[PDB]
């Protein structure tokens, strides 16, 4: 179907947020003393969530720079 | 673009301008000429004695010609903008 | 800036009329052009077209030679006009330009040529009118494409070509022996690329009747049969079929 | 393929090259130049530059590009989802609709200039042109198109100014500043015609025909 | 929901997009264009653009937006304060009143044009138009409305210019520069009529009717 | 100014009317053209149209040949008008255009060709009107497309073609033996792209009757049967069928 | 022949990508227990890949700074 840039950014932000929610739940369960979850899993997932968030930060910063360069144009 | 087409658009623009102005210039020249004819035969004058007749004439013209003038200008401009895409090439 | 183009076009039409009427079997030619507007910013353009209607000298028709003459003249006259689009009309319809069925005519004239040659050979023997042949020739009209990549087999090291070669040998004396060997070859290659013809013969079928003098002698029959076999270009691999029979006419 | 290094290294730099190359390789040059020239007509700014004309142009060019971006989505983003495509064939797969669009918009002789001055070899077809020759060709042809549109835009307000000045001159108005009277009539001609809709729509139509 | 990442990420980006898109999405476009055109009349600028008319336009748009922003507040900021709403239903709960407000001012035909150049299918009701269609339509309609108000504002000062010019010619003022004569009369006309009060009031009453 | 393009159309339609007037079986011919419109927001621009009304000469009707003549004339005249759109209407209805049965006509041509050839051969044998033949023929109108990718087999080493080969051998002496053989080949490859012809004959059914001289003798009959088998291009792999009989005529 | 700076950039990025792929496959092949591969070579290859990627990053930063500084001037 169509593109709908806004929808794409919405989906990307939902992906980042629920990845972090999964990492947070993993940390919750590990610190709460449940079977299954291992410390390597917790650390790896938390690092993955951090990397995804950092990538989001960079994409946002470049979009804002592009926006404030496009609308500082003199018509 | 070719100069043939730009001259075409230019003459169309000139003829819409002339039609737009025709009543005003026409009545201005007519009343000026009438007061200039009557300027002699009692050659008394200060400078013109025709300004107010010209103003009332253009008043009358803008009232009576009026709507068709504005309609012609609007139709010209609307057609120009409508066929603007098709004149690039 | 527009009507000038119309003036130019219709003046050209008059010019081409003035040309065509000076072609012999022509008295008048009314012509129409079809010029798409040349855009310089969109790419996908359209080719033009030409429609000529000619009034011939009464009782004169144009063979394909003069049809080609007029079509070529008109096509090359108009800027960038392929001779396909030139549609010609005889003063009573009758499209001299065929621009799905021409293959039937193509087979017909192929058979006509072969049959004519058979008659030309067999007439001097048995008479101008003592022989009939008809040809039924199967034709191929599929577009055949092909690409072969023949390689030569370098299995035999006597005739292989090595670019690089590493060979490690060891043996201890309880014997331990090792022999590693790596080889990079260069390979002979042939690449044919045939775009086979549209409209070749794929088989012939020819039947011939020869008139009586009384039946002709068996040797005289076999020599006529061999002659017509020669004239067919008879190829057995093509499965060409030929029959020659003798029996009196009506 | 690339490995979440150079991938996501080409991505961030692509976003860096976005604001100039990508907004001036697609649209928004013709549209913004027409808007600026229109604003030179009708007198003063009468529309905040950095805010309303620029934003409206950005929306409009998104709207023209939505079919090309749809085809780029279908031919890049969906297959680039983990499977059979990763930024090597994906590159020209995503270029091809955009190249088709630009060729369909370029002058048929600006390509000639930027090819002959590049010592480029003879070209077989439209597909054989490189992005290298395609960019400056598209920019120059788009500048030509923008200036043609601008000339046509300046026509009717020129008409209004001349008729106003002539009427004043005939009435004997030696020293009246005809621009002051003519400006409300410029807006007049621009609103009764419903000029903003017509102009926005005619730009969109001209941009693909 | 979102997890204090993208929350406080989309917040800061929303703030950055505020000054341009939000202001040229709500109001202050009509107000500022009408102020600019009033400044065109009355002679020279004679009122500082970069400070005073901008401030007054901001205050006018705040006052006009107070009902809209109050609806947005009661529908998001209380229910977004920690309970049952966290910046997903906050967005649409806040957009709906603003969407209704913007629809109430859009020209009936700008929406039509932008929908028809989106290849959007049929729409059922005013709730079916998306923000994608609704931004540029509102902007274009706002520009039209601003120019109409511009006419209504230029009319009386055009009258003063022409009547002063006519008196001066009939009297025999060969080439006195009537502009300098008419400027103080323009200011006089605009002060006795109590023009600043009644102008900002007229804009306000126009803007929601 | 809108008038000028419309008057251009009014001129062009009259010009074509005058061409059509000059073709014989015509008393009047008036034509209407249709440039569609500049369609909005889609670069589609559907094809134009042309509708022609003709008063034929009284009592004269036009064959499909001159129908194609006039339609192709008009299509080739109008700028970029495909001939499918050109519609003709005679003096009283009778849409000469059909805007699928060309298949039937083509099949009839094939059958008629075969039948006439059979008669051309057999007429000198049994007489001018002593034989009747009828041909019903099956044709393929389906669009085949084919791409074979023949590879040559290289299981045999002596016809193998090796680009590279790593070969390792080890052995100890209770014997521990090694043999590793990484081998890369270059493979012969053949690629036909056939696009089979449409309209090919796929099955003939030919029935022949001959008159009496008294029935013709058995050998005199089998020679006739062989001749007609020859004239059909009778091929067994096609499933062609042939029946010939002798009976008194009427 | 002609340079086509895009071609050189593509070549450099491909060099970095293939070097990292070699390192990643060798780590795959070591932790999977295949004979041969030694830990010293694995670590050295990983470090070489990191240095090459860092060189790519620094070159990127200088090229982007150059571009944004050329594009920040007035015609």
| Contact: E172, B47; criterion CB under 8 Å | yes
Return residues 121-140 of D near C (CB < 8 Å): 126
Tell me which DSSP letter residue B85 carries.
G
> Which residues is F180 bridged to in the sheet?
F168
E strand or H helix at F217: none
Around Cβ D98, how many Cβ atoms within 10 Å? 19
| Cβ–Cβ < 8 Å for E117, F42 | no
Q: How far is CA C35 from the centre of its chain?
A: 31
Decide: residue D20, CB within 10 A, 0-12 exposed, 13-18 middle, 19+ buried.
middle
Task: Characterise F59 by phi-psi region: left (phi > 0), alpha (psi -120 to 50), beta (else).
Answer: left
Q: Please report the DSSP string for chain C in residue order.
A: --HHHHHHHHHHHHHHHHHHTTSSS-SEEEEEEE-----SSS------EEEEEEEPPTT----HHHHHHHHHHHHHHSTT--TTTEEEE-SSS-BS-----HHHHHHHHHHHHHHHHHHHHHHHHH-TTSEEEEE--EEE-SEEE--EEEE----SGGG--EEEEEEEEEEE---EEEEEEEEEE---EEEE--BPPSSEEEE-EEEEEE----PPPHHHHHHHHHHHHHHHT--TTTT-EEEEEE----
Terminal C-alpha separation, chain D: 39
- Token pair recorded at residue G44: 């050295």
- Token pair recorded at residue C192: 């044919």
Of G12, F17, F165, the C-alpha closest to C163 is: F165
Q: Please report the DSSP string for F83-106 in residue order.
A: TTTEEEE-SSS-BSS----HHHHH
How far is the C-alpha of F166 from the C-alpha of D82, rounded, in Å? 35
| Cβ–Cβ < 8 Å for D8, A55 | yes
Which of C216-250 are b and which e, b meaning 16 or more Cβ less than 10 Å from the residue's Cβ?
beeeeeeebbebbeebbeeeeeeebbbbbbbbebe
Nearest CA in chain B to D165: B21
Kindly give the pairing relationship between strand F26-34 and strand F146-148.
unpaired
How far is the C-alpha of C31 from the C-alpha of C48, rounded, in Å? 14
- Could you tell me the CA-to-CA distances from E175 to B48, B56, C226, D111, E171 in Å, in that order? 14, 21, 118, 57, 11
Q: Say what angle helices E131-171 and D195-206 make with each other, to 10 degrees.
A: 130
- Token pair recorded at residue D157: 């307000």
| Cβ–Cβ < 8 Å for E166, B55 | yes
Tell me which DSSP letter residue F151 carries.
B
> Which residues is C55 bridged to in the sheet?
C28
| Contact: D183, E155; criterion CB under 8 Å | no
Decide: residue C168, CB within 10 A, 0-12 exposed, 13-18 middle, 19+ buried.
exposed
Return residues 145-204 of E near F (CB < 8 Å): none
How far is the C-alpha of F153 from the C-alpha of F190, rounded, in Å? 12
B near G: at least 3 beta-carbon pairs less than 8 Å apart:
no
Kindly give the pairing relationship between strand C49-55 and strand C86-89.
parallel
How far is the C-alpha of C103 from the C-alpha of F109, rounded, in Å? 12
Three-class secondary structure of residue F2 per DSSP: helix
Read off φ and ψ for residue C239, nearest 5 degrees.
65, 30
Return residues 148-207 of E near B (CB < 8 Å): 166, 169-170, 172, 174
| Contact: F40, E116; criterion CB under 8 Å | yes
How far is the C-alpha of F8 from the C-alpha of C6, rounded, in Å? 8
| Cβ–Cβ < 8 Å for C216, C122 | no
Q: Which of C155, C242, C249 sits opposite F158 (nearest CB)?
A: C155
Of D128, D40, D126, D27, the C-alpha closest to D69 is: D27
| Cβ–Cβ < 8 Å for E169, B51 | yes
Residues 6+ apart with CB under 8 A from D101: D26, D68
> Taken in order D17, D21, D24, D27, is the CA torsion positive or negative?
negative
Residues 6+ apart with CB under 8 A from D77: none
| Cβ–Cβ < 8 Å for C182, F183 | no
| Cβ–Cβ < 8 Å for F87, F52 | yes
Q: Please report the DSSP string for D110-179 in residue order.
A: HHHHHHHTTTPPPP-SGGG--HHHHHHHHHHHHHHHHHHHHHHHHHHHHHHHHHHHHHHHHTT-TT--HH
Torsion of CA E138, E142, E145, E149, to 10 degrees: 160
Q: Which chain F residues contact residue C38 at CB under 8 A?
A: none
Q: How far is CA D59 from the centre of its chain?
A: 12
How far is the C-alpha of F3 from the C-alpha of F8, rounded, in Å? 8
Mutate to test the interface with C, among B1, B2, B6, B8 (most CBs of C within 10 A): B8
Tell me which DSSP letter residue F166 carries.
E
Q: Which chain C residues contact residue B8 at CB under 8 A?
A: 1-2
Tell me which DSSP letter residue E104 carries.
T
- Could you tell me the CA-to-CA distances from A5 to A2, A47, D85, F124 in Å, in that order? 9, 28, 22, 84
Q: Which chain B residues contact residue C45 at CB under 8 A?
A: none
Decide: residue F136, CB within 10 A, 0-12 exposed, 13-18 middle, 19+ buried.
middle
| Contact: A56, E1; criterion CB under 8 Å | no
How far is the C-alpha of E72 from the C-alpha of E89, rounded, in Å? 12
Overall resolution, Å:
3.7
Around Cβ G23, how many Cβ atoms within 10 Å? 21
- Token pair recorded at residue C137: 């020739």
CA-based Rg of chain E, rounded to a whole angstrom?
Answer: 22
| Contact: B55, E172; criterion CB under 8 Å | no
Tell me which DSSP letter residue A61 carries.
H
| Cβ–Cβ < 8 Å for C84, C77 | no
How far is the C-alpha of E79 from the C-alpha of F9, rounded, in Å? 68
- Token pair recorded at residue D128: 């054989």
| Cβ–Cβ < 8 Å for D34, G41 | no
Residues 6+ apart with CB under 8 A from F233: C136, C137, C138, C203, C205, C241, F114, F204, F240
How far is the C-alpha of E150 from the C-alpha of D184, rounded, in Å? 8
How far is the C-alpha of F122 from the C-alpha of F130, rounded, in Å? 9
Residues 6+ apart with CB under 8 A from C67: C88, C96, C97
Q: Which of C53, C147, C181 sits opposite F23 (nearest CB)?
A: C53
Domain-wise residue ranges, chain B: 1-89
Torsion of CA F96, F99, F100, F106, to 10 degrees: 30
How far is the C-alpha of C140 from the C-alpha of C131, rounded, in Å? 29
How far is the C-alpha of D42 from the C-alpha of D187, rounded, in Å? 6
- Could you tell me the CA-to-CA distances from G6 to A46, D94, G2 in Å, in that order? 37, 17, 11
Tell me which DSSP letter residue E29 carries.
H
> Which residues is E170 bridged to in the sheet?
none
E strand or H helix at F33: strand F26-34
Residues, chain B, total?
A: 89
Strand order in the sheet with C143-145: C143-145, F192-195, F146-148
Asked if F22 reaches chain C (Cβ–Cβ under 8 Å), the answer is yes
Decide: residue C18, CB within 10 A, 0-12 exposed, 13-18 middle, 19+ buried.
exposed
Q: Say what angle helices E54-72 and E89-103 make with each other, to 10 degrees.
A: 120
Tell me which DSSP letter residue G23 carries.
H
Of E31, E76, E4, E83, the C-alpha closest to E206 is: E31
How far is the C-alpha of F245 from the C-alpha of C105, rounded, in Å? 31
| Cβ–Cβ < 8 Å for B80, F2 | no
| Cβ–Cβ < 8 Å for D114, D133 | yes
Around Cβ E59, how many Cβ atoms within 10 Å? 12
How far is the C-alpha of F118 from the C-alpha of F232, rounded, in Å? 7
Q: Which chain B residues contact residue C40 at CB under 8 A?
A: 89
| Cβ–Cβ < 8 Å for B79, D155 | no
Q: Give residue for tokens 């300027």.
A: B39
Q: Please report the DSSP string for E157-178 in residue order.
A: HHHHHHHHHHHHHHHT-SS--H
| Cβ–Cβ < 8 Å for F75, F81 | yes
Query: What is the CB-side half-sphere exposure of residue F123 using CA atoms within 13 A?
Result: 11
Mutate to test the interface with E, among A7, A10, A17, A69 (most CBs of E within 10 A): A17
Terminal C-alpha separation, chain B: 7
Nearest CA in chain D to B1: D148
> Which residues is F165 bridged to in the sheet?
C183, F183
Around Cβ F208, how many Cβ atoms within 10 Å? 24
Of C158, C149, C162, C180, the C-alpha closest to F162 is: C162
Read off φ and ψ for residue A73, nearest 5 degrees.
-65, 140
> Taken in order E117, E121, E124, E126, is the CA torsion positive or negative?
negative
Task: Characterise E87 by phi-psi region: left (phi > 0), alpha (psi -120 to 50), beta (else).
Answer: left
Residues 6+ apart with CB under 8 A from C110: C135, C137, C139, C201
How far is the C-alpha of E61 from the C-alpha of E105, rounded, in Å? 15
Q: Name the structure determination technique.
A: cryo-EM
| Cβ–Cβ < 8 Å for F173, C174 | yes
Asked if B84 reaches chain D (Cβ–Cβ under 8 Å), the answer is yes
């Amino acid at each position: 179907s169509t593109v709908s840039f806004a929808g794409q950014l919405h989906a990307a932000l939902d992906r980042i947020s629920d990845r972090q929610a999964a990492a947070r739940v993993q940390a919750e369960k590990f610190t709460l003393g449940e079977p299954g979850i291992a410390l390597n899993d917790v650390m790896a997932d938390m690092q993955k969530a951090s990397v995804s968030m950092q990538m989001g930060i960079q994409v946002r910063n470049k979009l804002v720079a592009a926006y404030q360069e496009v609308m500082s144009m003199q018509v | 673009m070719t100069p043939e087409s730009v001259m075409m658009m230019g003459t169309e623009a000139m003829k819409v301008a002339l039609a737009l102005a025709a009543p005003l210039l026409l009545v201005a020249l007519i009343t000026g000429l009438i007061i200039s004819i009557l300027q002699a035969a009692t050659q008394i004058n200060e400078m013109t004695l025709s300004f107010i007749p010209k103003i009332v004439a253009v008043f009358i013209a803008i009232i009576v010609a009026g709507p068709w003038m504005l309609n012609l200008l609007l139709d010209y401009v609307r057609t120009l903008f409508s066929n603007l895409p098709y004149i690039i090439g | 800036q527009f009507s000038e183009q119309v003036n130019y076009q219709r003046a050209l039409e008059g010019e081409l009329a003035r040309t065509i009427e000076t072609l012999g079997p022509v008295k008048s030619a009314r012509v129409h052009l079809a010029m798409p507007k040349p855009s310089l910013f969109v790419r996908e353009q359209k080719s033009p077209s030409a429609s000529v209607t000619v009034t011939l000298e009464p009782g004169r028709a144009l063979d394909e030679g003069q049809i080609s003459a007029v079509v070529h003249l008109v096509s090359s006259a108009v800027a960038g006009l392929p001779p396909g689009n030139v549609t010609l009309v005889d003063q009573s319809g009758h499209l001299l330009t065929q621009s799905n069925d021409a293959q039937l005519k193509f087979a017909n004239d192929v058979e006509s040529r072969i049959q004519r040659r058979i008659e030309a050979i067999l007439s001097p023997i048995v008479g101008n009118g003592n022989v009939h042949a008809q040809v039924t020739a199967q034709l191929d009209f599929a577009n055949k494409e092909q690409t072969e990549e023949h390689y030569s087999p370098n299995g035999d090291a006597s005739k292989a070509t090595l670019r690089s070669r590493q060979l490690n040998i060891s043996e201890q004396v309880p014997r331990s022996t090792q022999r590693n060997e790596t080889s990079n070859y260069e390979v002979d290659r042939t690449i044919r690329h045939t775009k086979m013809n549209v409209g070749d013969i794929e088989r012939l079928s020819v039947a011939v009747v020869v008139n009586y003098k009384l039946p002709l002698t068996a040797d005289q029959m076999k020599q006529i049969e061999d002659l017509t076999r020669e004239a067919m270009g008879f190829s057995d691999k093509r499965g060409d079929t030929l029959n020659v029979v003798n029996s009196p006419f009506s | 393929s690339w490995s979440l290094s150079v991938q996501t290294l080409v991505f961030i730099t692509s976003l860096t090259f976005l604001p100039a190359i990508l907004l001036m390789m697609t649209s928004f040059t013709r549209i913004i130049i027409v808007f600026g020239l229109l604003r030179n007509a009708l007198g003063t700014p009468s529309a905040p530059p950095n805010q309303v004309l620029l934003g409206l142009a950005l929306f409009l060019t998104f709207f023209i590009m939505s079919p090309v971006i749809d085809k780029i989505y279908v031919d890049a983003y969906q297959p680039f989802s983990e499977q059979k495509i990763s930024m090597q064939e994906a590159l020209d797969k995503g270029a091809q609709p955009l190249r088709a669009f630009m060729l369909r918009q370029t002058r048929e002789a600006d390509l000639a200039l930027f090819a002959r001055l590049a010592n480029s070899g003879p070209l077989q077809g439209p597909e054989a042109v490189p992005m290298r020759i395609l960019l400056p060709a598209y920019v120059t042809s788009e500048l030509k198109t923008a200036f043609q549109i601008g000339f046509t835009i300046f026509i009717p307000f020129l008409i209004i100014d001349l008729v106003i000045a002539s009427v004043l001159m005939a009435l004997g108005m030696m020293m009246v500043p005809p621009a002051t009277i003519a400006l409300p009539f410029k807006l007049m001609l621009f609103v009764l015609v419903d000029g903003w809709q017509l102009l926005m729509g005619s730009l969109a139509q001209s941009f693909y025909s």
